[PDB]
Design a protein around this motif. Sequence first.
Motif, PDB file in Angstrom:
ATOM      1  N   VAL A 235       0.843  -1.182   0.000  1.00 27.33           N
ATOM      2  CA  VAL A 235       0.000   0.000   0.000  1.00 27.33           C
ATOM      3  C   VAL A 235       0.871   1.220   0.000  1.00 27.33           C
ATOM      4  O   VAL A 235       1.854   1.291   0.736  1.00 27.33           O
ATOM      5  CB  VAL A 235      -0.935   0.041   1.212  1.00 27.33           C
ATOM      6  N   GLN A 236       0.521   2.169  -0.854  1.00 29.10           N
ATOM      7  CA  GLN A 236       1.262   3.412  -0.953  1.00 29.10           C
ATOM      8  C   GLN A 236       0.303   4.537  -0.715  1.00 29.10           C
ATOM      9  O   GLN A 236      -0.773   4.553  -1.292  1.00 29.10           O
ATOM     10  CB  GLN A 236       1.910   3.559  -2.319  1.00 29.10           C
ATOM     11  N   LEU A 237       0.672   5.484   0.134  1.00 29.96           N
ATOM     12  CA  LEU A 237      -0.224   6.604   0.374  1.00 29.96           C
ATOM     13  C   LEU A 237       0.159   7.782  -0.486  1.00 29.96           C
ATOM     14  O   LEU A 237       1.348   8.089  -0.642  1.00 29.96           O
ATOM     15  CB  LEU A 237      -0.202   7.031   1.835  1.00 29.96           C
ATOM     16  N   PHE A 238      -0.849   8.439  -1.049  1.00 25.16           N
ATOM     17  CA  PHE A 238      -0.603   9.692  -1.732  1.00 25.16           C
ATOM     18  C   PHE A 238      -0.868  10.801  -0.727  1.00 25.16           C
ATOM     19  O   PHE A 238      -2.022  11.127  -0.449  1.00 25.16           O
ATOM     20  CB  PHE A 238      -1.502   9.844  -2.956  1.00 25.16           C
ATOM     21  N   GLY A 239       0.210  11.393  -0.209  1.00 17.49           N
ATOM     22  CA  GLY A 239       0.121  12.369   0.864  1.00 17.49           C
ATOM     23  C   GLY A 239       0.823  11.871   2.118  1.00 17.49           C
ATOM     24  O   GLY A 239       1.653  10.966   2.036  1.00 17.49           O
ATOM     25  N   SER A 240       0.468  12.421   3.283  1.00 19.28           N
ATOM     26  CA  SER A 240       1.111  12.023   4.548  1.00 19.28           C
ATOM     27  C   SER A 240       0.271  12.038   5.800  1.00 19.28           C
ATOM     28  O   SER A 240      -0.618  12.859   5.982  1.00 19.28           O
ATOM     29  CB  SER A 240       2.335  12.889   4.827  1.00 19.28           C
ATOM     30  N   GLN A 241       0.604  11.112   6.681  1.00 18.53           N
ATOM     31  CA  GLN A 241      -0.003  11.053   7.985  1.00 18.53           C
ATOM     32  C   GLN A 241       0.582  12.226   8.777  1.00 18.53           C
ATOM     33  O   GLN A 241       1.654  12.752   8.447  1.00 18.53           O
ATOM     34  CB  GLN A 241       0.318   9.718   8.663  1.00 18.53           C
ATOM     35  N   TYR A 242      -0.153  12.670   9.783  1.00 16.13           N
ATOM     36  CA  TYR A 242       0.290  13.749  10.638  1.00 16.13           C
ATOM     37  C   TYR A 242       1.511  13.404  11.505  1.00 16.13           C
ATOM     38  O   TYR A 242       1.623  12.311  12.111  1.00 16.13           O
ATOM     39  CB  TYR A 242      -0.870  14.206  11.506  1.00 16.13           C
ATOM     40  N   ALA A 243       2.430  14.370  11.496  1.00 16.74           N
ATOM     41  CA  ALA A 243       3.615  14.470  12.335  1.00 16.74           C
ATOM     42  C   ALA A 243       3.558  15.789  13.061  1.00 16.74           C
ATOM     43  O   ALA A 243       2.877  16.716  12.619  1.00 16.74           O
ATOM     44  CB  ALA A 243       4.875  14.405  11.516  1.00 16.74           C
ATOM     45  N   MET A 244       4.277  15.880  14.171  1.00 16.82           N
ATOM     46  CA  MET A 244       4.405  17.147  14.872  1.00 16.82           C
ATOM     47  C   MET A 244       5.399  17.995  14.082  1.00 16.82           C
ATOM     48  O   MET A 244       6.602  17.911  14.310  1.00 16.82           O
ATOM     49  CB  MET A 244       4.885  16.916  16.303  1.00 16.82           C
ATOM     50  N   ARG A 245       4.903  18.813  13.158  1.00 19.48           N
ATOM     51  CA  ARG A 245       5.780  19.638  12.338  1.00 19.48           C
ATOM     52  C   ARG A 245       6.103  20.939  13.042  1.00 19.48           C
ATOM     53  O   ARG A 245       5.234  21.803  13.196  1.00 19.48           O
ATOM     54  CB  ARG A 245       5.158  19.933  10.968  1.00 19.48           C
ATOM     55  N   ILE A 246       7.372  21.048  13.445  1.00 20.48           N
ATOM     56  CA  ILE A 246       7.916  22.150  14.251  1.00 20.48           C
ATOM     57  C   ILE A 246       9.004  22.972  13.527  1.00 20.48           C
ATOM     58  O   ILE A 246      10.142  22.524  13.306  1.00 20.48           O
ATOM     59  CB  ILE A 246       8.471  21.610  15.574  1.00 20.48           C
ATOM     60  N   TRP A 247       8.627  24.200  13.192  1.00 22.55           N
ATOM     61  CA  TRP A 247       9.387  25.044  12.267  1.00 22.55           C
ATOM     62  C   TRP A 247      10.203  26.156  12.948  1.00 22.55           C
ATOM     63  O   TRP A 247       9.671  27.209  13.319  1.00 22.55           O
ATOM     64  CB  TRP A 247       8.423  25.662  11.240  1.00 22.55           C
ATOM     65  N   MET A 248      11.500  25.902  13.083  1.00 21.53           N
ATOM     66  CA  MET A 248      12.436  26.809  13.726  1.00 21.53           C
ATOM     67  C   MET A 248      12.565  28.124  12.992  1.00 21.53           C
ATOM     68  O   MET A 248      12.387  28.177  11.776  1.00 21.53           O
ATOM     69  CB  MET A 248      13.810  26.169  13.799  1.00 21.53           C
ATOM     70  N   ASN A 249      12.861  29.185  13.740  1.00 23.54           N
ATOM     71  CA  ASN A 249      13.221  30.472  13.156  1.00 23.54           C
ATOM     72  C   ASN A 249      14.660  30.802  13.477  1.00 23.54           C
ATOM     73  O   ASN A 249      15.021  30.894  14.626  1.00 23.54           O
ATOM     74  CB  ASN A 249      12.312  31.580  13.661  1.00 23.54           C
ATOM     75  N   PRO A 250      15.482  30.995  12.450  1.00 22.24           N
ATOM     76  CA  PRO A 250      16.931  31.204  12.572  1.00 22.24           C
ATOM     77  C   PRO A 250      17.250  32.550  13.222  1.00 22.24           C
ATOM     78  O   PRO A 250      18.258  32.704  13.919  1.00 22.24           O
ATOM     79  CB  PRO A 250      17.414  31.168  11.126  1.00 22.24           C
ATOM     80  N   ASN A 251      16.391  33.530  12.961  1.00 25.27           N
ATOM     81  CA  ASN A 251      16.470  34.796  13.656  1.00 25.27           C
ATOM     82  C   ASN A 251      16.220  34.470  15.122  1.00 25.27           C
ATOM     83  O   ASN A 251      17.139  34.505  15.935  1.00 25.27           O
ATOM     84  CB  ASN A 251      15.413  35.773  13.120  1.00 25.27           C
ATOM     85  N   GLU A 252      14.993  34.048  15.421  1.00 22.48           N
ATOM     86  CA  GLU A 252      14.571  33.629  16.755  1.00 22.48           C
ATOM     87  C   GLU A 252      15.346  32.434  17.295  1.00 22.48           C
ATOM     88  O   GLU A 252      15.070  31.950  18.399  1.00 22.48           O
ATOM     89  CB  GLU A 252      13.090  33.298  16.740  1.00 22.48           C
ATOM     90  N   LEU A 253      16.288  31.930  16.504  1.00 18.12           N
ATOM     91  CA  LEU A 253      17.200  30.920  17.011  1.00 18.12           C
ATOM     92  C   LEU A 253      18.536  31.578  17.276  1.00 18.12           C
ATOM     93  O   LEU A 253      19.245  31.162  18.180  1.00 18.12           O
ATOM     94  CB  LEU A 253      17.386  29.750  16.051  1.00 18.12           C
TER      95      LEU A 253
END
Lengths: 50, 50
Positions: A25-43
Amino acid sequence: QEDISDYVAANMKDAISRTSGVGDVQLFGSQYAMRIWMNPNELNKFQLTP
Amino acid sequence: FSAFSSSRWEYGSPRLERYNGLPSMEILGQAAPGKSTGEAMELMEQLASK
């Protein structure tokens, strides 16, 4: 996309991937992950790295 | 420990069951003494629908 994809992935894709007569079975798309997007300024700000 | 541990009592499950990939709970049961199991099963299926 990710919405549906998650519903498919967390309700259906797992009963179908076992279901009788079915191999790969192949999925077109993706199951949910905790997508956490860093900010390099704020980093660079609080002197913190990934 | 009491220097950094908040502590209380609560409940919890001692046995977490799964059927076909998903969280489930198992019900045993019988049909009346001179009863066909299929009758009992039909009734069961008619309760679980509410």
